């Protein structure tokens, strides 16, 4: 009863034909380097090796239109344009390999589904899916932002339909808003979608994910956009995400009280990225602590699935920290400067905006006042004296 | 029309 890992080198074949390496950030070396890091650190040997598979067209159609699944899930046995790099794609970001991309994208979904079901049924404690292409930007009938099929959303739908799971939490800590995942569950109160993302008043990719997007119909209140606004003045870092987890993510998630937790685990908020791709300064170590916090929910029934994250050192460092956390290893302590740092004013304003909006729906936010400005030490000092 | 780019950090618009 341990941590599972799923990975498949056939996902490396989703690759542009152009030969212009610097042009495509979402490249095969992303998952290849993560897998090598997990192997050489000994973490792979501590985990169960889970074999993936291709998702069926019917499984993909729990989220996407039939036409969308045929266009991107089958090959001829137009929506595709000749790109300036010389390859083919659906937009300037999102390449299409006419031979390999359909199978690779279906394999990414199937890997996530296989791992998610083994955790949900108790064959595994928890797990991490090392998959590409990413999924959370793909809408019902629109690929975008490197994504074709929303692997995490498909897994959640299948949990509902095949295992009758009544409460699913999706946490999305990729630096970008998961517009596809938000769409897929917007009217559904049985799935809580919670995204932390760079929002900057709608001036960052993809442009969605405002705090006042709370859901629709019976789903009102079950969509939580922890949207950071203010730009990179200063960039968000460990203190800001830890405060957001303390004030927003964990109180709401605990009140929701899920049966299963799915994490859209992009690492493009880690320090060392080109600022247009994220520009935040999270440490890899911090993602281990965030993972450990989410492991307290749903009895530990949690799966992380790789989304974005592009700097190889950054995503390998963060994957290592997250898998170490899933295995129950002791994490390195956070630096003293991080524990003592108060979240920056833009993050405080961002957190308080979200709390004001969702105080209408969540009793845990009908708290007395806001503690969003407290450092971790200041918050822990006030917790010990209370209880 | 449509613009927007994850590589450039530009939101999708119009
Ligand atoms: K996100
Ligand atoms: K929802
Ligand atoms: Zn290309
Ligand atoms: Zn991203």
Residue numbers in the entry:
A (entry chain G): 652 to 728, 744 to 1053
B (entry chain A): 1358 to 1371
Which sentences from the paper describe this structure?
The HDAC domains of class IIa HDACs repress the respective target genes by interacting with the C-terminal region of the silencing mediator for retinoid and thyroid receptor (SMRT) repression domain 3 (SRD3c). Here, we found that two conserved GSI-containing motifs of SRD3c are critical for HDAC4 binding. Two SMRT peptides including these motifs commonly form a β-hairpin structure in the cleft and block the catalytic entry site of HDAC4. They interact mainly with class IIa HDAC-specific residues of HDAC4 in a closed conformation.
